[PDB]
C-alpha cells in the first residue's frame, strides 16, 4: 500500500473521537490532550489552539490517555507510549498479548491495566528519572476480588497505594509490595466512573443507574448518595476553586452541577453532546479555575464558565448559570464532498452527512468555522417557508465554487440530496446566500457548476434541463435542454464560449455560450457518472460506467485518452494542476494516478478505507481525500514538487531514465560535421576578449588607502626548470610528444579567464618559438574536433593580442608559417556559418518588415 507519488500529511478537521481525554497542568497554563484514532493531539486551554500532534501515528487505536506535567502517556493496542512534544521519546512494552484499557500514572510508579484484570506496575530506575521504564511487578485481580477494572485512580496523600475500582467493589494495592491492603463492601450497582476529590481520602463513584456514591476510603463507608433519575453516568469531576461544585456528566448529553454545601442542584445543561455518539464522555474542571472542558464522541470540545455571582453580598446561594466559551469541533459524520476555496491551498470546504458545511483551514487548524445556515430575509417582503422549529439543510452531494469574484455576491453553489433547488453560499461572509435556484422541470439536482468569471451558475436537473442562473438577482437567464436522462456533469471553459455537459444517456453535448447553438454531440457507450474539467489544458475527463476514464478534448470533438483498470465504480476523480495527472478513487479501495501522456497508471495506493472523494489542490502541493469512515479529511503531500517522477506502468507489478523522468538532456554534439559551441555560460567568450577593460571599469574611482607595513606574502600566508614548469606547459610538451592535444584542450576550456590570460601571454616561447607552434597545432586539432568553436576562436584572438608582435617579427620562417597555414586550411571551412548568418537575418529582416 506504499506510494511513490503521495505521502500522508495529517488528518485535517478532527478534534476528538470519544475516548476520555486527559488534561495536564503545566505551570499556570493547562493543555487538553485528546486522541483521534491512530494519533493524538494537544490543545491549549486558554485559546484552544492545536499545539502538537503525534509525529508518527500509532499502529492501532489509542485506548487510554494520561498526562503528567510534560510527558503525555498514550496507550494503544499492546504498548503504552511516553511522548513529549509529539516526539516518541520512549516506548514502554507490556509483556502480555492482552489489550491495555486504563492507564494511571502517579510518582515513579506507572500503572497500566490490561483488559483481562491485570495491573502492570512500572518503576523509574533512577529516582530522578523523567518517566518509568523498568518493569516492577504484575498485579492480578481475580474473579473473587471483583469484576473488570473500571478505572485506576491514585488518591491524594497515600504512600505507594493504588486505588482500583471494579464493577462491584473498590480495592487498594500497595504497589511497592504488590499486596492488597483493603477491600470495599460490594456495590449492588455497576460502577462506571471514578474520580479523586479535593477532600482527602474521598473518591466519587458513578454508576449506570444514576447514583453518585461518594466513598470515604479511610472509614470504608459511603457519605453522600446523589441520585440522578435513570441516566447513565459517564463523567465526574469537582470544581477545585473552593466552592463546592460537583460536575456529573451523563452519556445522554446532559451535564448536571450539584452544590454539595446546600445539597441542591445548580443547572442541567441539555444537549452539549449528541446522544448516539456517546454523549458527555469526559468532562473536568481546570484545577482551581471555573472553566470546565467537556468532550464526547460528536467530534467537538466545548468550554463552559461559571460566572461570578450577580449578588455583591450573598454569593454562594445565587450562583450563575454555566456559559458557553471556546469550542473546537468537526463533523460528527464522515465528510462526503470536499472542494478547495482558493488557489493558495488555504481553505477547504467540506460538506458531511451531519447536515452541515464547514470551512476548514489547511494552514492554521484553529481557523476552521461552521458556515452558518441562517437564511437571509426575502426581498419581496413575504415571509419565507420552512419549519418554525429550525433544522439543518439536507446532505450536500454536489458543490461548485468560483474564487474570481468573491465577497461581492454569492460564489458557492451547493447541491443537496433529494432537493429540487440548489443553494447559494457566500465564502467571504461564511453564510448561506439569499438565492435558491430551482430546476423548473420537477427534478433533483445532480450536478452544478460555475463560470470562471463567476457571474453565471449552471444547474443540472434530473430530467435533463441544464438551466443557467445568474448570481446577482438569482434570475434565470437560459434553459438548455438536450438530454433525456439525468445530467451528471456541467462545465464551461475559460473563454465563456465552450459549454460541455454529460448525462446518463452517454451524451457529451457541446454548446456555445455566447450564442445559443449546439456545437456538436458525442455519443459514448457507457453512461457518464462524474466529470471534472481542467480549464488550462481544455481537457475534461469522464468517469464512465464500463469502469474506465475517458478524457475528451473540449474543442476537437473527440476522445483523446482512454484509461482502463479499475475493478469497481470510479467514485471521484480530479486533475493535476499542470494537467499531467488524473487521480481516481474507486470502490475496490484503490487509488490510481494515471499519467495522461503515457496513458497508464504510475502509482497505485491500496488505501484501507474506501475513498469516497479525491481532490487536488489548485496549488501543486496537496491531494485531499475523504474516506468512507473517519470524520476527518486525509491530506497527502505531493512528492512531485521535490523529487522527479518516473512515468512507469506499475499496476500489474504491484497488484532509459531520460524518457521515464520526462526530461530530455541535450546532446553535446549532433554530428561531427556540425559546428557546436562550448558547454558553459555564453558570456565566457565576452570576458576572454575584454578581460582588461572589465577590471578597469570595476576598479574603484580612487586608490584605496593601505597600511604599507603589511606582510609581503600575506596571500601565501593562508592559514591552514623541468620540475618547476606548469601543468599546462608539461601537458603542452607532452602534447607534442604524443601528437594529441585533446588532453590539453580539456584543461584549456575549464581554466578561469584570468588564468587563461595569464596562460596565453606567458607561453615561454620567445627564442625557439616552440610552444607557439605547439599551441597553434593544439588549436588546429581543436577546430578539427568542431566542439567549443567559440572558445577556440577567442584563444588565438588572445594569441594575436599577446604575441602578435612576436610572430610578425619572425614571420616567413618555414616552421611558424607551416603551423599558421595549417590552421587556415582548417579554418577555410568556417565560412559556412558566416554564409548562414548573413543569409538568415537578411531573410528575418525582410520577412518581418514586409
Amino acid at each position: 500500500k506504499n506510494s511513490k507519488i503521495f505521502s500522508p500529511f495529517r488528518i485535517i478537521g478532527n478534534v476528538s473521537n470519544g475516548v476520555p481525554f486527559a488534561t495536564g497542568t503545566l505551570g499556570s497554563t493547562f493543555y487538553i490532550v485528546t486522541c483521534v484514532g491512530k494519533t493524538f493531539q494537544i490543545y491549549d486551554a486558554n485559546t484552544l489552539h492545536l499545539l502538537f500532534v503525534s509525529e508518527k501515528e500509532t499502529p492501532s487505536s489509542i485506548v487510554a490517555l494520561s498526562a503528567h506535567f510534560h510527558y503525555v502517556y498514550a496507550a494503544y493496542e499492546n504498548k503504552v507510549g511516553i511522548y513529549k512534544r509529539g516526539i516518541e521519546e520512549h516506548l514502554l512494552e507490556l509483556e502480555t498479548d492482552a489489550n491495555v484499557e486504563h492507564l494511571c500514572i502517579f510518582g515513579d510508579y506507572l500503572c497500566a491495566s490490561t483488559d483481562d484484570n491485570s495491573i502492570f506496575i512500572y518503576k523509574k530506575s533512577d529516582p530522578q528519572d523523567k518517566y518509568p521504564s523498568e518493569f516492577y511487578t504484575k498485579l492480578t485481580v481475580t474473579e473473587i476480588q471483583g469484576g473488570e477494572i473500571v478505572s485506576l485512580q491514585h488518591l491524594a496523600t497515600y504512600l505507594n497505594k493504588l486505588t482500583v475500582v471494579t464493577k462491584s467493589n473498590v480495592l487498594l494495592f500497595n504497589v511497592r509490595t504488590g499486596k492488597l491492603v483493603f477491600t470495599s463492601n460490594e456495590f449492588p450497582d455497576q460502577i462506571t466512573t471514578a474520580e479523586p476529590a479535593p477532600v482527602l481520602d474521598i473518591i466519587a463513584l458513578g454508576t449506570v443507574t444514576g447514583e453518585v456514591i461518594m466513598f470515604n476510603m479511610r472509614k470504608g463507608k459511603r457519605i453522600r448518595t446523589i441520585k440522578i433519575p435513570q441516566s447513565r453516568i459517564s463523567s465526574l469531576s469537582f470544581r477545585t476553586d473552593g466552592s463546592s461544585h460537583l460536575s456529573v456528566g451523563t452519556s445522554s448529553g446532559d451535564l448536571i452541577f450539584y452544590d454539595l454545601d446546600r445539597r441542591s442542584r445548580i443547572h442541567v445543561l441539555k444537549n452539549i453532546h449528541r446522544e448516539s455518539y456517546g454523549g458527555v464522555t469526559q468532562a473536568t474542571f481546570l484545577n482551581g479555575q471555573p472553566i470546565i472542558v467537556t468532550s464526547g464522541g460528536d467530534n467537538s470540545l466545548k468550554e463552559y464558565v461559571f460566572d461570578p455571582s450577580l449578588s455583591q453580598g450573598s454569593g454562594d446561594v445565587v450562583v450563575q448559570p454555566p456559559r458557553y466559551l471556546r469550542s473546537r469541533g468537526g463533523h460528527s459524520q464522515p465528510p462526503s464532498y470536499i472542494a478547495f476555496a482558493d488557489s493558495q491551498s488555504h481553505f477547504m470546504l467540506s460538506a458531511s452527512k451531519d447536515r452541515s458545511l464547514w470551512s476548514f483551514s489547511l494552514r492554521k487548524d484553529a481557523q476552521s468555522q461552521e458556515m452558518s445556515q441562517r437564511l437571509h430575509k426575502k426581498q419581496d417582503g413575504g415571509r419565507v417557508g420552512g419549519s418554525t422549529i429550525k433544522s439543518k439543510f439536507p446532505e450536500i452531494v454536489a458543490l461548485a465554487i468560483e474564487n474570481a469574484r468573491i465577497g461581492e455576491w454569492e460564489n458557492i453553489i451547493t447541491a443537496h440530496k433529494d432537493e429540487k433547488f440548489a443553494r447559494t453560499w457566500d465564502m467571504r461572509n461564511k453564510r448561506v446566500g439569499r438565492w435558491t435556484f430551482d430546476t423548473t422541470d420537477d427534478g433533483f439536482v445532480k450536478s452544478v457548476a460555475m463560470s470562471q468569471c463567476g457571474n453565471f451558475g449552471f444547474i443540472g436537473s434530473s430530467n435533463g434541463s441544464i438551466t443557467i442562473y445568474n448570481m446577482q438577482s438569482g434570475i434565470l437567464r437560459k434553459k438548455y435542454k438536450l438530454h433525456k436522462r439525468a445530467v451528471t456533469g456541467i462545465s464551461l471553459d475559460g473563454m465563456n464560449r465552450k459549454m460541455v455537459s454529460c448525462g446518463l444517456d452517454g451524451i457529451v453535448g457541446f454548446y456555445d455560450f455566447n450564442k445559443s447553438t449546439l456545437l456538436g454531440k458525442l455519443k459514448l457507450d457507457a453512461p457518464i457518472t462524474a466529470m471534472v474539467y481542467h480549464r488550462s489544458s481544455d481537457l475534461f475527463a469522464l468517469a464512465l460506467d464500463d469502469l474506465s476514464i475517458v478524457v475528451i478534448d473540449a474543442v476537437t470533438q473527440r476522445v483523446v485518452r482512454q484509461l482502463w483498470g479499475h475493478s469497481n465504480r470510479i467514485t471521484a476523480f480530479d486533475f493535476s494542476p499542470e494537467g499531467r495527472w488524473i487521480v481516481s478513487a474507486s470502490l475496490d479501495s484503490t487509488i490510481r494516478t494515471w499519467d495522461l501522456p503515457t496513458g497508464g497508471c504510475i502509482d497505485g495506493i491500496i488505501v484501507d478505507n474506501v475513498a469516497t472523494n479525491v481532490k487536488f489542490s489548485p496549488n501543486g502541493d496537496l491531494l485531499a481525500t475523504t474516506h468512507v469512515t473517519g470524520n476527518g479529511i486525509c491530506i497527502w503531500t505531493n512528492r512531485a514538487q521535490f523529487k522527479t517522477v518516473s512515468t512507469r506502468t506499475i499496476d500489474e507489478s504491484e497488484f532509459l531514465n531520460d524518457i521515464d523522468f520526462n526530461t530530455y538532456t541535450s546532446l553535446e554534439q549532433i554530428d561531427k560535421e556540425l559546428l557546436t559551441l562550448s558547454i558553459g555560460p555564453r558570456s565566457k567568450m565576452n570576458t576572454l576578449l575584454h578581460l582588461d577593460v572589465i577590471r578597469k571599469r570595476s576598479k574603484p574611482k580612487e586608490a584605496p588607502k593601505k597600511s604599507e607595513k603589511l606582510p609581503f606574502f600575506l596571500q601565501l600566508s593562508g592559514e591552514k626548470r623541468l620540475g618547476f614548469e606548469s601543468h599546462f606547459t608539461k601537458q603542452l610538451r607532452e602534447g607534442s610528444q604524443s601528437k594529441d592535444y585533446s588532453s590539453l584542450l580539456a584543461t584549456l576550456i575549464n581554466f578561469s579567464p584570468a588564468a587563461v590570460d595569464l596562460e596565453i601571454r606567458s607561453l615561454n616561447s620567445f627564442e625557439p618559438f616552440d610552444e607557439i607552434v605547439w599551441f597553434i597545432d593544439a588549436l588546429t586539432q581543436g577546430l578539427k574536433s568542431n566542439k567549443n568553436f567559440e572558445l577556440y576562436e577567442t584563444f588565438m584572438s588572445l594569441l594575436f593580442k599577446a604575441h602578435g608582435d612576436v610572430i610578425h617579427a619572425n614571420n616567413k620562417n618555414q616552421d611558424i608559417a607551416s603551423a599558421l597555414q595549417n590552421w587556415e586550411d582548417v579554418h577555410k571551412k568556417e565560412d559556412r556559418l558566416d554564409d548562414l548568418v548573413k543569409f538568415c537575418m537578411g531573410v528575418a529582416a525582410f520577412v518581418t518588415t514586409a
Binding site: 554530428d671 557546436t676 576598479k699 594575436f800 619572425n810 538568415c840 531573410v843
Partner: protein, 834 residues
C-alpha cells in the same frame, strides 16, 4: 497562453537583512523585502523565489550542502525552502523577533538568535517527505540579559558563541557533556557587542563591538582561564560599527561603519589592509565567501549591493536598486534589456538574465516620469518633470539633444514615432501635445485642443498617427503627417487615461476612471468592445484609511494598459494590489495576479485585523521611532505633504503598493510590471504544463520515440507538436539529420508553424548548436517565409526572438571569425621586422 507565474524580480537587488553566499562562490543570495533573490556570478543567470513572505526578511542562512534554505521574517515567521526543488517545506512561527540564523558547517543542526534566547534546532532531512512537525529543538539557552544580536558557529560543530545587546558575549557548547569546557562569559566592551568569532584555531576569540573596540581573548595565565591579550581600536570618531564578519582561514575582519566606510583587518597584527567607501549610507550587512576572497557588502537606505574581492583592488558588481521609485518601464526590441525610470532621475538599463543594471543615466535632475524606445532599440527617449525630454544612445551612452518647451512646463508621458523622426510628450500643466523633431531640437508646433491634461500618447506603427488620452474624457486622433493636419475626437464615458494601441495599428485600448476598459478602431471611430474591470480589482484598505475596502474609491481603476504583440491580450495594472490579463475578443479575464503580500506596504489587505485598533488610534500607526536605541533613525524629517516625495524618511507612513508601467516582452511570452516592490517579471518559460492540440488515442510519447526508430521524421515532429511537450519536441529536433531538414521544414503544416518558431527562438538562446539551429532557421524561412509575411502579427513575438538569437549570440561569433581571419591575413603576408 495564460499559465503565467512569477520568475524574476528585476531590480531591488538588496533591501534589508543578511546577505549571504553559497558554500561555493557561485550563488549570491540577497534578501529582497519580500523574497530571496538567488543570483549567480559565474554562470550569469538570475533567479527569484516564487514564494512570498508576510513581511520583510530579517535573516537568511543557507546549508553548507546547498540544499536547505531558511528565511526568517522580522516577526519570526520562518519558512523552509528546499533549495534545489525551489519549493516550500514548512512554515514555522518563532514567537519573538529573530536576528541571526546560522547553520552548523556540518549542517545537522542550526542555531537561532531570537529575543534574549539562543534556540538550537535539528534540521529536518531533505529527502524525507513533507511532515507536519519537521522541527525538533535540541535546547534553548537563556543565559543573557538583553536581545541576542549576532551568532557565529565554530569551525567545528560543537561550540556556539552569541553576542547580545547586553555588554556580555557568551560561548555555549551544543553538547551536554562539554558544558564545563566552554561556559565562561566574555564582557568588558563599552558598547553594543555585535560580533565575536573563533580564530583559525579554536583557541582565540576576537570580539568586535559598536564603539570600535576589538578584544582578543586568549586562554592563558595572568588554574587559569580567558584573559585579554590585546585590545584594538578603530578610532572612528562618529562612525559606529553596524555589522561584522570574519573568515578565519584568511583571518580577515570586514567591519561596517554607519558613515559608509568599510575596513579590512588581519587579526593577530591589526593592520588595515584596505579601506574603501560607498557613500553616505550605513553599511548594513557584511558577509564573506567560504574561500575567503569574495566579500558581499550591502547598504539599505539606498538599496545597493557591492560584491568586492579584497585581494585585487577592484569590484565585481556595484549595483543599486531603488525602492518605491520606478515610475515607468520600456522594453528593448530584443527581450533581454528592460530599462526603467526612477524618482531620482536615474534611467537604468537592467538585464533580464542577471538581475543587475548594465548602465545608469543620471542626467535628469528631476524625477523621470515616462520612458520609451524607438528605432530598433539603438536610440531611446525619456520624459521628466525637469522640463525636458532627453534622447539617449545605447551605443555611446550619451544624449543627442535635450528637447525643451518654450517655458519648461512639466511632463507626464512620452511617445515616439516608430521611425526616429518625431518625439512628443504631454503635460499636467500646459496640456498641449508638444512635438519635436529628432534632427532639429526646436519644437515644430503645439498640437492643442484639449481641456485638461493629456495623460498618455502613442504613435501607430503602421498608419503613423498618434492617439491622445486626456482628462477631457475624449480620445483625440491626430493625423500630423502629409498635408492632413486633421483632428478626430472619440469621446468616452469618464476621465480616460493610460492609452495603448495594437501593433497592428488599427485599435486603441484605453482605461477610463470609471473602471471600464474600452477598445476602439482608429480608422472607423465607432467602439468595437468594452470590458468591465471594477469587480476583479483588489483595492487594499490602508492602515490610515477610514472606509471599507468595498467603497474604497482609491484604486478601483486601471492606470496602465499594454497590448500583447500578438494582438490577443491586454495586461491591465493599476494603483491597486492586482495585475489582470484580459483577452481582447473574448471579453473575459484570463487570470489575476497579486503583486505583493506585505503589510510593510500599505494596501496588501482588504480585511485589516481587529486587534490593532485600540480605543484610540491604530496600533501600527503609532510613531514608534523613539523606542530605537540609535540617533539617525530617531531623527524625523517627515514633511506633512510628502505624498510620493523624493525620499522615504520624509514619508511618515508606509509606502503604498501600486504598479505603474507594464509592457509585454517582445520575445518570450512574458510581461514585466514596474511595482512598488521593484520590477516584477511574470513568465511562462518553465513550460511544465500539458497543453495538447488535436490529440488522439494512438498518439503517445511511446509513439514519438518509435517514429524516430523507423525514421518517419515529419510524422515524428508534427505529432510531437500534438502533445506540445518541450522535451518531446527537443527529442525529435536534435535527432533528425541535416539532409532531411529541408524536406521536413517544407511540409510542416500551417497550424504548427507558430509553435516551432517559438521553440527554436526559445531553445537556441542557450544552446551550443549554433550551426544546427541556424540551418533550421534558414530552411524554415526559405520554405515558408511567404506565410510569415502574410501573417506578421501571429509570428511577431517568435520572429523577434529568432533575430534576437542571431544578433545577440550568433553575430559576435561571426565577428570574431572575421576579426581573427583579417588579423591572420595581415600578420602572415605583410612585412617582417628590423
Amino acid at each position: 497562453k495564460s499559465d503565467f507565474k512569477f520568475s524574476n524580480l528585476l531590480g531591488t537587488v538588496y533591501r534589508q537583512g543578511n546577505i549571504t553566499f553559497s558554500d561555493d562562490g557561485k550563488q549570491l543570495l540577497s534578501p529582497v523585502g519580500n523574497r530571496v533573490s538567488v543570483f549567480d556570478l559565474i554562470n550569469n543567470k538570475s533567479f527569484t523565489f516564487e514564494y512570498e513572505h508576510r513581511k520583510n526578511i530579517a535573516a537568511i542562512d543557507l546549508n553548507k550542502q546547498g540544499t536547505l534554505l531558511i528565511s526568517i521574517d522580522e516577526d519570526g515567521r520562518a519558512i523552509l525552502v528546499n533549495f534545489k526543488a525551489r519549493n516550500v517545506l514548512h512554515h514555522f512561527n518563532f514567537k519573538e523577533k529573530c536576528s541571526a540564523v546560522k547553520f552548523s558547517p556540518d549542517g545537522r543542526l542550526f542555531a537561532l538568535a531570537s529575543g534574549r534566547f539562543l534556540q538550537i534546532w535539528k534540521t529536518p532531512d531533505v529527502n524525507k517527505d513533507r511532515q507536519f512537525a519537521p522541527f525538533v529543538r535540541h535546547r534553548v539557552h537563556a543565559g543573557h540579559f538583553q536581545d541576542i544580536t549576532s551568532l557565529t558557529w565554530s569551525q567545528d560543530s560543537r561550540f556556539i558563541l552569541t553576542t547580545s545587546k547586553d555588554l556580555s558575549a557568551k560561548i555555549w557548547s551544543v553538547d551536554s557533556e562539554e558544558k564545563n569546557l566552554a561556559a565562561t562569559t566574555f564582557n568588558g566592551h563599552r558598547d553594543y557587542v555585535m560580533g565575536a568569532f573563533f580564530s583559525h584555531d579554536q583557541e582565540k576569540i576576537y570580539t568586535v563591538s559598536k564603539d570600535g573596540a576589538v578584544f582578543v581573548w586568549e586562554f592563558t595565565k595572568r588554574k587559569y582561564s580567558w584573559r585579554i591579550t590585546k585590545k584594538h581600536f578603530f578610532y572612528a570618531n562618529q562612525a559606529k560599527v553596524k555589522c561584522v564578519t570574519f573568515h578565519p582561514a584568511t583571518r580577515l575582519l570586514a567591519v561596517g561603519f554607519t558613515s559608509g566606510e568599510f575596513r579590512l583587518y588581519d587579526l593577530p597584527d591589526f593592520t588595515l589592509i584596505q579601506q574603501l567607501s560607498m557613500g553616505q549610507n550605513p553599511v548594513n550587512t557584511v558577509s564573506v565567501n567560504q574561500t575567503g576572497e569574495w566579500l558581499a557588502f550591502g547598504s539599505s537606505k539606498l538599496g545597493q549591493l557591492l560584491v568586492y574581492e579584497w585581494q585585487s583592488e577592484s569590484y565585481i558588481l556595484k549595483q543599486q536598486g531603488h525602492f518605491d521609485s520606478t515610475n515607468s518601464l520600456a522594453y528593448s526590441p530584443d527581450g533581454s534589456r528592460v530599462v526603467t525610470a526612477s524618482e531620482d532621475g536615474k534611467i537604468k538599463v537592467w538585464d533580464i538574465t542577471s538581475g543587475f543594471c548594465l548602465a545608469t543615466f543620471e542626467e535628469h535632475t528631476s524625477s523621470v516620469t515616462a520612458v520609451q524606445f524607438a528605432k530598433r532599440g539603438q536610440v531611446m527617449f525619456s520624459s521628466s518633470l525637469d522640463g525636458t525630454v532627453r534622447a539617449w544612445d545605447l551605443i555611446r551612452y550619451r544624449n543627442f539633444r535635450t528637447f525643451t518647451g518654450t517655458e519648461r512646463i512639466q511632463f507626464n508621458c512620452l511617445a515616439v514615432d516608430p521611425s526616429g523622426e518625431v518625439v512628443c510628450a504631454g503635460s499636467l500643466d500646459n496640456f498641449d501635445i508638444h512635438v519635436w523633431s529628432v534632427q532639429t531640437g526646436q519644437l515644430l508646433d503645439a498640437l492643442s485642443g484639449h481641456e485638461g491634461p493629456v495623460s498618455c500618447l502613442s504613435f501607430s506603427q503602421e498608419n503613423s498617427v498618434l492617439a491622445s488620452a486626456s482628462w477631457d474624457k475624449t480620445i483625440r486622433i491626430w493625423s500630423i503627417f502629409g498635408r492632413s493636419q486633421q483632428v478626430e475626437p472619440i469621446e468616452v464615458y469618464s476621465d480616460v487615461l493610460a492609452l495603448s494601441m495594437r501593433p497592428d495599428g488599427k485599435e486603441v485600448a484605453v482605461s477610463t476612471l470609471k473602471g471600464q476598459i474600452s477598445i476602439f478602431n482608429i480608422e472607423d471611430a465607432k467602439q468595437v468592445g468594452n470590458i468591465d474591470c471594477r469587480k476583479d480589482i483588489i483595492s487594499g484598505r490602508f492602515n490610515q484609511d477610514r472606509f471599507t475596502a468595498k467603497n474604497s474609491e482609491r484604486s478601483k481603476f486601471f492606470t496602465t494598459i499594454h497590448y500583447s504583440f500578438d494582438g490577443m491580450a491586454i495586461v491591465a495594472g493599476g494603483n491597486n494590489n492586482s495585475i489582470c490579463l484580459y483577452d481582447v475578443p473574448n471579453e473575459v479575464l484570463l487570470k489575476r495576479f497579486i503583486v505583493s503580500r506585505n503589510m510593510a506596504l500599505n494596501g496588501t489587505l482588504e480585511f485589516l485585523n481587529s486587534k490593532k485598533m485600540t480605543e484610540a488610534g491604530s496600533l501600527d500607526l503609532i510613531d514608534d521611532a523613539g523606542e530605537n536605541s540609535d540617533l539617525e533613525d530617531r531623527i524625523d524629517n517627515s514633511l506633512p505633504g510628502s505624498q510620493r516625495g523624493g525620499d522615504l524618511s520624509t514619508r511618515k507612513m508606509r509606502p503604498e503598493v501600486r504598479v505603474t508601467s507594464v509592457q509585454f516582452s517582445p520575445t518570450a511570452n512574458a510581461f514585466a510590471a514596474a511595482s512598488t516592490e521593484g520590477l516584477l517579471i511574470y513568465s511562462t518559460n518553465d513550460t511544465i504544463l500539458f497543453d495538447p492540440f488535436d490529440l488522439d488515442v494512438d498518439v503517445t510519447p511511446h509513439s514519438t520515440v518509435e517514429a524516430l526508430r523507423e525514421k518517419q521524421f515529419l510524422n515524428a515532429l508534427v505529432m510531437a507538436f500534438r502533445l506540445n511537450e518541450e522535451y518531446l519536441i527537443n527529442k525529435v529536433y536534435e535527432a533528425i539529420p541535416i539532409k532531411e531538414i529541408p524536406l521536413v521544414a517544407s511540409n510542416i503544416p500551417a497550424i504548427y508553424l507558430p509553435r516551432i518558431l517559438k521553440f527554436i527562438g526559445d531553445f537556441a538562446i542557450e544552446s551550443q548548436h549554433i550551426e544546427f539551429n541556424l540551418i533550421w532557421i534558414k530552411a524554415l524561412l526559405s520554405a515558408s517565409g511567404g506565410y510569415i509575411n502574410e501573417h506578421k502579427y501571429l509570428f511577431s513575438t517568435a520572429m523577434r526572438s529568432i533575430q534576437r538569437f542571431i544578433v545577440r549570440v550568433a553575430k559576435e561569433v561571426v565577428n570574431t571569425t572575421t576579426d581573427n581571419k583579417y588579423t591572420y591575413r595581415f600578420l602572415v603576408s605583410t612585412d617582417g621586422s628590423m
